[PDB]
Structure formats: structure tokens, C-alpha cells
Design a protein around this ligand. Sequence first.
Ligand SMILES: [Mg+2]
Ligand SMILES: [Mg+2]
Ligand SMILES: [Mg+2]
Ligand SMILES: [Mg+2]
Lengths: 231, 231, 10, 10
Amino acid sequence: GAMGSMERASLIQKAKLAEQAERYEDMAAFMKGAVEKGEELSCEERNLLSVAYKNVVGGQRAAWRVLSSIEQKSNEGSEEGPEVREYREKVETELQGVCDTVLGLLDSHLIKEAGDAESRVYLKMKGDYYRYLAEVATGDDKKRIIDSARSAYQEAMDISKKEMPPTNPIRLGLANFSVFHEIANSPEEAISLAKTTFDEAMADLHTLSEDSYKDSTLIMQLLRDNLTLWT
Amino acid sequence: GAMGSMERASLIQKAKLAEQAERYEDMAAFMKGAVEKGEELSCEERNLLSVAYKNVVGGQRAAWRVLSSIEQKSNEGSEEGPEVREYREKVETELQGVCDTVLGLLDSHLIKEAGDAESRVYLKMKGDYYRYLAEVATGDDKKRIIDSARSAYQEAMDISKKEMPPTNPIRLGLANFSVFHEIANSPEEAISLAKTTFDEAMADLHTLSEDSYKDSTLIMQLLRDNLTLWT
Amino acid sequence: PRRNTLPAMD
Amino acid sequence: PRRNTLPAMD
Ligand SMILES: [Mg+2]
Ligand SMILES: [Mg+2]
Ligand SMILES: [Mg+2]
Ligand SMILES: [Mg+2]
């Protein structure tokens, strides 16, 4: 609501300046305010939204994994206070808010108005931020958060299979689903999806310009290293 | 005031966990709340305070210098909006608050109760955060902010000369004053202070243990590179 | 070395 | 390369 009196174009301009500044909280705040203007988002504006929230949740995820480990060492001959647990909690509570903020923007109303394949294949974002909630969930809803993410990934997978070529960078990035398969305890599903996705992009590379070629090979290489680490 | 219901030791413990987490805003928030308990600070607690605020203002300084430059290019055959000026302003306003927050903690009441040389030689901190305000000041008080910083550095310099050996890392770090001399437009004063400080530490190194030796040579090397860049 | 996910952090 | 000041950023 903070950005409600600033112009849509002004928020886009300041979101890119925030990127250059590496002020990713401002960048998320601008792009949230841009989303809340009610207009659909251009392919470029989609990337600014995604890039901003990825960096904020990305440092929150990094800090959480640091605290969680000191906390595990704290409970194994260990000299005993609640301070590690309290701070790991607060940071995690902060992380859960940011995911809940992104999911609320996809749900109001970015997914319902996304009609084209490229825009709708937001469901990936929806899968990513439930996966982040999954990474920290330990209770009576961890099974339900995982299904929330899996279902979102699977909707994006069906549209991407039917509507985009096998080298399409959005399809290749979507095929994160494989890493979910570290959350879902399905490492064979993880590896099959990656070798299948890789091999079919490889067979389609002859159709691509030198520019498209470089884009697709980038993400195929992220699949190659993952396969390399799992095999 | 946010930290007023948490224990002093708890705030120190969480300030170090925030360091490990690289959550330097939390670290500054904990150390501010620790300062505001009213007790003097240990040499180790002094470094946690200094390290936290240095990182926050450090990224704010970095972002400001990025915005300021795009803003200069924006006013030189340049296609014209106020958005660059508005965001550079907000960030700078944010930076001025953090400096005003640190200066308020030194003034209430860290400098008046600092009796020992090492603790009192806070005046360096006081010089650093006026210097940061100086870096962004363009109006009717830029002359007064510079004198605010110079005076603070000079008080620390007199105590450090009288009360600490010439290799003392606090004295060597204090001798930042030379870089102030980029704010004060006195590059010859800058260089003299650095060669003088370097040469007299060099002559005192034979008095030092292998541990103290490594510490002092670190900061003497920061003086050597600066001299190298200015000469 | 961690596994890769789309996208990355600055 | 910038000039050195005490201390540095992580
Ligand atoms: Mg507004
Ligand atoms: Mg097998
Ligand atoms: Mg409190
Ligand atoms: Mg000369």
C-alpha cells in the first residue's frame, strides 16, 4: 500500500535503479507496488519482480541455514540459552512473510489474468515460494505445503509441455521441479526429469539462432551440473 | 527502544549470531539495544558495534555512489523524470539517519564515560560517521560537518599520540584521518600523515610479539597501498 | 557447491 | 580500486 501514490512507470524505473544499487528490498517493494496497480505485467516486468524477491528470500534462506546449523550443533556434549532458537525463529518468521507476500501477489491476481503460456508458466514462482516454505516447515502442514508446491509445478509442467518448445528457457528453468524432487525425497524422479529435459532440449538446439542457443545452453548446463552431482 | 525487554548478554549473543548470518541490520539493532542498557562496553563489544554499523552504512554508501553517478550522467545530450533524484534522496536520507543514530549513541553516553585511552580513542567512530555525512552534504552545513569530523579525529589523535604506542592498531586505524584529508582537500596533509604514521610504527615493530606484529603490519599495509595510490 | 536452481542471487 | 579505510565490509 506504501507505493499506491506513485506512478506505475515510476515504480518500474526505480525497481531497475534498485537492481543497479543492489537494494533488493527496495526492488521488491517497488515491484510489489507495481503489481498492486492491477495491470498485467510485461515479460521484462515479470523478470524484475522475480529477480527482486529471489534475492531477498535468497539471503533470508542463507541466514536461516547458518542459524539452523549452529542450532543443531547446540543440541548434540554441548554446553547449553534460547537465543539461537529465538533468532532462527524470527528470521524464519521473516522468511515466511516474504513467501506469503509473493504467493499473495500471484493469487491476487497475477495467475487468474495470465492467459499466455509464457506468463502463466507464475505457477513456477508459485512452486518456488511454497518450496521455500517447505524448506523450513516441520509440523502438521509440511505435507500440505509440499503438495501445494508439487501441484503448482505440475500445472506449469503440463502447459509447458503442450505450449512451448523443449529449449524454451522458461520450460528449462521450470524443469527447479527436479530439485523439489531434496524436498519430495524422490531423487530418481529428480534425475529422470533432468536427463529427459536435457536430452530433448539438446535435440531441438539446431532450430535456434546464435542468441537463443546461448540462452538455452546456459540452463541445460545447470541441469548437467545437477545430474553430475546426483550421479 | 525495541530491545529494551531483552537481556544485555542475550543481545551480545544474538549480535554475534547476526554477524555469522551476515544480517548486519539485526547486528546493528542488537548492538544499539546493548549500548542503550547504559553499561560501558568491553573491547570486544566495541568491535561488534563498529563492525555492524560499518556494514550497513557501507552498503548505503555503495548504493548512494551508484545512484549519484547515474544522476550525474542524467544531467550532462541526455534524454530527461525526478525518479533518479527521488530515489538517490531517499537512500541518502536513510544513510543520514544511520549516521545520526550512531552519533547519538556516542553522544549518549559512550564518549563521556569512556575513560581509558583505547575506548575513548569512539572519537574515531565519531569522525568516521561525520565523514560519511560529509560525503553526501552539499549545502549550508557541509563546512560545519567537516569541522565536526576534523575536530573529532584531532581529539583522538592527541590522546593516541600521548597514550598509545605507535604500532597500536587503534592508533594506526585512526591514522582514516589521512583519507579525510578526499573530504578536506588536503592531499599533502593526507600523505605526510600516512608516511609519518607508517615510518614510526615500522621503528617500533621490534617490540612486538609475533601476534601483535601480524596485527600492526596489516594496517601499515593499508597505509602503504594508500601512499602507493596517492604518490 | 550447492545444486543449481533458477534463478540465482546477485 | 578504492583507497583503504578502517574497517572493511564483510
Ligand atoms: Mg506512495
Ligand atoms: Mg536407482
Ligand atoms: Mg525488547
Ligand atoms: Mg607536493
